[PDB]
């Protein structure tokens, strides 16, 4: 496979051994077994017709050569003389018929497990689907080729039935929209760690973006159009959501997508006008930055989506009625508001104990969001929003205490006071509207 011979037809060999390579891969028995899709994908882009396919062939042959050279030094050099060893092997010589068919069979057997491991390390979660997808913009192919030509950036090791693990537990044909998800995620984790440890928490963002601009990946990504980088931005944002956070829903996926985008926008506005790091606002590492600044206010938000899925439906109109995610993050506050509205809506259902459960499961996230130091810095409008959100949260928290005490007690011990307490709770609810601050005199 050494570049500049015609001693073998390598493309023919790989098309012959792709089937055997993919046949040995094992998914976890339900994780979208796509073996036929994989072999078709490989064999419709392992040709010499398109320029992208020719460059892919060259890069794949380079990968095969380097892996074979790395694995050959382990041999005792009696296996380096493959022709002589196979010829002295009477069994396989008389098994495969003619001597040249025997030699080609031995090459097939030698190459097929290395190619199987390569396919295992390539199609981690459906990364071949991006090259298979038509009309994909230039960025997908360009970063795929840049990653594929960098042995040091992506180390591919070889091991027999090999297992392929699902990083995201992806749904039916999810095919994460960035070429290699886990690879960039781990590389950016390492880069952020290096930035966070080299410097203190005073110029961390500048050093992080600068050290991302220093890597060849950054200088290569910088040449793409702004629209292409934006497309990369939401694709990376959604696949980061999928990898870091598991979600049994697609609408909530876009909801935390918008939440993390608004968090990124707010972090961009944290600095007044540095006009040096602001020259690259639409970059990949910013997303990581947002996470590592707002992890709490994201994960807590995820809790609100997981404990009470019904609130999502209410939120499905709230974004329409208030136009959230404009400058900063208030989506967890919106989920809290819609949840509180629904809580006061259904109120005493046939099972008021279920109402107690569905108010107390969600007490702690609303306690945590309404805390000082939770928002380090933001606009004055968000100050007013958080003031009123603590006001309403404390109001409904007092309501929840009243319910979980008196409504539980009357229904558990003496069911003869319900019609009176159900009206007195309404009276105290209606009398506390104007003064949502119980520290003063008149509410007490």
């Amino acid at each position: 496979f050494k570049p500049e011979s015609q001693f073998l037809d390598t493309t023919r060999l790989v098309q012959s051994c792709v089937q055997g390579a993919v046949g040995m891969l094992r998914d976890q028995n339900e994780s979208c077994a796509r073996n036929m899709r994989r072999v078709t994908i490989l064999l419709d882009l392992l040709n010499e017709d398109n320029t992208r396919n020719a460059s892919f062939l060259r890069e794949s042959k380079m990968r095969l050569h380097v892996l074979l050279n790395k694995q050959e030094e382990n041999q005792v050099r009696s296996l380096k003389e493959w022709v002589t060893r196979e010829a002295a092997n009477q069994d396989a010589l008389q098994e495969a018929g003619t001597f040249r068919h025997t030699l080609w069979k031995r090459v097939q057997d030698v190459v097929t497990p290395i190619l199987a491991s390569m396919i295992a390390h390539i199609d981690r979660d459906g990364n071949l689907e991006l090259l298979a997808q038509p009309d994909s913009p230039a960025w997908v192919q360009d970063l795929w080729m840049f990653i594929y030509s960098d042995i040091k950036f992506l180390n591919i090791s070889l091991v027999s039935f090999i297992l392929v693990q699902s990083h995201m537990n992806l749904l039916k044909d999810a095919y994460n929209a960035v070429p290699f998800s886990w690879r960039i995620r781990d590389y950016l984790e390492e880069l952020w760690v290096q930035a966070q440890y080299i410097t203190d928490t005073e110029g961390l963002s500048k050093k992080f973006v600068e050290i991302f601009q220093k890597t060849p990946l950054g200088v290569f990504l910088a040449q793409f159009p702004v629209a292409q980088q934006q497309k990369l931005l939401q694709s990376y944002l959604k696949d980061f959501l999928l990898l870091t956070m598991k979600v049994s829903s697609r609408e909530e996926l876009m909801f935390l997508q918008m939440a993390l985008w608004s968090c990124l926008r707010e972090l961009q506005e944290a600095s007044g006008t540095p006009d040096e790091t602001y020259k690259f606002p639409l970059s990949l590492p910013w997303v990581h930055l947002a996470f590592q600044h707002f992890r709490t206010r994201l994960q807590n938000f995820s809790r609100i989506l997981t404990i009470h899925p019904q609130v999502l439906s209410s939120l499905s109109q709230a974004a329409e009625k208030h136009s959230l995610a404009g400058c900063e993050m208030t989506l967890d506050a919106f989920a809290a508001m819609a949840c509180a509205e629904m809580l006061k809506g259904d109120l005493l259902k046939p099972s008021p104990k279920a109402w107690l459960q569905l108010v107390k499961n969600l007490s702690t996230p609303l306690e945590l969001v309404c805390s000082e130091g939770y928002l380090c810095d933001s606009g004055s409008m968000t100050r007013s929003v958080i003031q009123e959100v603590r006001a309403l949260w404390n109001r409904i928290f007092s309501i929840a205490l009243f319910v979980e005490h008196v409504l539980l007690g009357t229904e558990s011990h003496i069911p003869e006071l319900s019609p009176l307490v159900t009206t007195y709770v309404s009276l105290l609810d209606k009398c506390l509207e104007e003064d949502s601050n119980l520290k003063t005199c008149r509410p007490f």
Partner: protein
């Protein structure tokens, strides 16, 4: 003590484990939590009394305690004195009173367990030779200890006054200002004041978590407040839960970077930590491994006792350091890599147990559940005792006073329960074991799991007689048979881990579905008339065919199997096999035989259970019930029993040669 050789000693963790296995006292491990069914205070009291018992025994004869206690071989005196020192330190830390008064209380307990002459301890072994009698004796000890401890607070002031009245320490000026006498006798003193009274300037006890355990267990908190008791029972181990996310990230990174088997050359952990190209990652991983090793050291005491995954004791015997071996941190499931896996498993198990008990007590229903694939910093219980637990518990210690004058300490359990519940313990979901990082070690080359996967996915059926005739006549050459075997094995591996259509015969499958180009047209003609719904059957037939061809010429037919199975049959056994072959379905018999032989008779370590003294009928009927459903009675009731399994490939040779004589000499 000589009669106590390997006897069931009490107050020891149970996973039997007889003896005196206990770690070194100078350890940063758990607080020696109580056993399955004993109160911790009674447990500690019994443990210290027993400790004094073997201390007296060892001072009587050291060799008996040397042979009783497993780990040490040097001396029992220092080890036992360190245990007694730690026991008295734990006693003075748990009981809320002066240390002299704790020694007074333990003396009171020792004297009070002496006038209990009423004998009701019957039906128990005096040699502690059974677990049942050990538990029975522990039950009597618990009953008597409760009876004595329930009547101690009414004797402490009286005994203090009587002891202070001893007319030999009373001359000592120290005991006047110490042991309950006013210090007004000192002439160098300020005048009497309403603030400088003796009782105002008196010592008072300190509130501690162990004293909380004592107060909640002495007030019968099982029926009133069980959540606090469960929380403080395992508070020591849950103090390490905050480090779960970063160590899970360590397992994730190790799995991601080293998804390899038998390819790691690193020998020392220090080499790994010091062979990274990034300094930020280097020192991060340094801090992370330091935390991992500290948590491992603090928690290598209950894993072998209550952990779900059994582990040998060769891992929890040596302390981990920065220069320790490498395989400890690899999250494996076989040996020496099970350390971190078992640790995180126990952490998840304790979290799940606590959330389950809390839900079963108050919630009664919850749908909030999450895998380990999105574990965050706040998702697990993360608190510091010196900054979080101490203030929240000390804020609820009410003081009550009376008209006559007294200061009483009372705890409102509801207040503290609502405080601790509404802060950390509530909002914790049920973690699942689905997404635990783990390296894969074993392989599925054995080819049976493939067959059962085929039978699960597809409704397999038998091969047509015309199709088998055409493929047999078409594949008469040996090279063609080998090519067909390779291709059909590739398709078998493809079908084991993927789906397909029971129709869609192998030709169109091969040509375009996996787009396998043409090698020879003869094998394609053979595959023209075989369906996927017979694929496994096809494989076995073709496999047998290949070896049968190797029998037809003068070439060695296995070249891989052990020599212990390559020997010729006896004359009488040859006659028996011939009389069997006289009337039988030879094709199916030889097919099943070759399906058996080529799979497991692979040479070394093929005699793990395959001892060469069995019979063909026994092993054939042992196999046949796994996946296949071929003809039965012909081998159940006709096949000879004395076949000497050792020479069983000889039976296949005889059957294949007779089938050759059938096919060729007949036609």
């Amino acid at each position: 003590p000589v009669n106590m050789a390997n006897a069931f000693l009490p107050t020891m963790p149970e996973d039997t484990q007889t003896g005196h296995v206990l770690g070194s006292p100078q350890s940063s491990g758990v607080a020696e939590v109580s056993d399955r069914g004993q109160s911790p205070v009674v447990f500690i009291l019994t443990r210290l009394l027993t400790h004094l018992a073997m201390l007296v025994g060892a001072t009587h004869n050291p060799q008996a305690l040397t042979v009783i206690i497993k780990p040490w071989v040097q001396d029992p005196q220092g080890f036992l004195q360190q245990h007694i020192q730690r026991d008295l330190e734990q006693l003075t830390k748990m009981l809320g009173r002066s240390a002299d008064e704790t020694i007074h209380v333990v003396h009171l307990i020792l004297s009070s367990l002496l006038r209990v002459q009423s004998h009701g301890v019957l039906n128990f072994n005096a040699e502690l030779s059974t677990k049942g009698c050990r538990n029975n004796w522990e039950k009597h000890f618990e009953t008597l200890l409760l009876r004595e401890l329930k009547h101690l607070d009414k004797n402490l002031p009286a005994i203090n006054a009587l002891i202070s009245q001893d007319e030999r320490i009373s001359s000592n000026p120290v005991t006047k200002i110490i042991y309950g006498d006013p210090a007004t006798f000192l002439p160098h003193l300020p005048q009497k004041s309403i603030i400088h009274c003796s009782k105002i300037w008196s010592c008072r006890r300190k509130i501690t978590v162990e004293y909380l355990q004592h107060i909640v267990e002495q007030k019968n908190g099982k029926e009133t407040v069980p959540v606090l008791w469960h929380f403080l029972q395992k508070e020591a181990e849950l103090r390490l839960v905050k480090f779960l996310p970063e160590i899970l990230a360590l397992q994730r990174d190790l799995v991601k970077q080293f998804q390899n088997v038998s390819r790691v050359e690193y020998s020392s952990i220090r080499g790994f930590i010091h062979s990274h190209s990034s300094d930020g990652l280097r020192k991060l991983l340094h801090d992370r491994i330091t935390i991992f090793l500290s948590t491992w050291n603090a928690l290598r005491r209950s894993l072998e006792t209550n952990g779900e995954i059994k582990l040998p004791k060769d891992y929890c015997c040596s302390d981990l350091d920065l220069d320790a071996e490498f395989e400890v941190i690899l999250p494996r499931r076989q040996g020496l890599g099970l350390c971190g896996t078992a640790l995180v498993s126990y952490l998840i198990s304790l979290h799940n147990n606590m959330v389950y008990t809390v839900q079963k007590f108050s919630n009664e229903d919850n749908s909030y559940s999450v895998d380990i694939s999105e574990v965050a910093d706040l998702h697990v219980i993360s608190y510091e005792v010196e900054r979080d637990l101490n203030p929240l518990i000390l804020s609820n210690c009410q003081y009550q006073v009376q008209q006559g004058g007294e200061t009483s300490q009372e705890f409102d359990l509801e207040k503290i329960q609502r405080q601790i519940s509404s802060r950390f313990l509530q909002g914790k979901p049920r973690l699942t074991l689905k997404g635990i990082p783990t390296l894969v070690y074993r392989r599925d080359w054995n080819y049976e799991h493939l067959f059962m996967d085929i039978k699960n996915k597809m409704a397999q059926s038998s091969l047509p007689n015309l199709a088998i005739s055409t493929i047999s006549g078409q594949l008469q050459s040996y090279s063609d048979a080998c090519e067909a075997l390779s291709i059909i094995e590739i398709t078998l591996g493809f079908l084991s881990t993927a789906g397909g259509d029971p129709g869609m015969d192998l030709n169109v499958y091969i040509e375009e579905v996996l787009r396998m180009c043409d090698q020879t047209a003869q094998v394609l003609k053979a595959f023209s008339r075989c369906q996927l719904r017979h694929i496994i059957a096809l494989w076995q037939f073709l496999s047998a065919h290949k070896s049968e061809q190797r029998l037809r010429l003068n070439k060695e037919l296995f070249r891989e199997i052990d020599v212990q199975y390559k020997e010729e049959l006896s004359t009488q056994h040859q006659r028996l096999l011939g009389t069997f072959l006289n009337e039988a379905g030879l094709d199916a018999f030889l097919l099943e035989l070759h399906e058996m032989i080529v799979l497991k008779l692979k040479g070394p370590r093929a005699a793990n259970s395959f001892n060469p003294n069995w019979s063909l009928k026994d092993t054939l009927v042992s196999y046949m019930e796994t996946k296949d459903s071929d003809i039965l009675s012909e081998v159940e009731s006709q096949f000879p029993e004395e076949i000497l399994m050792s020479s069983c490939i000889s039976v296949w040779k005889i059957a294949a040669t007779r089938k050759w004589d059938r096919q060729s000499r007949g036609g």
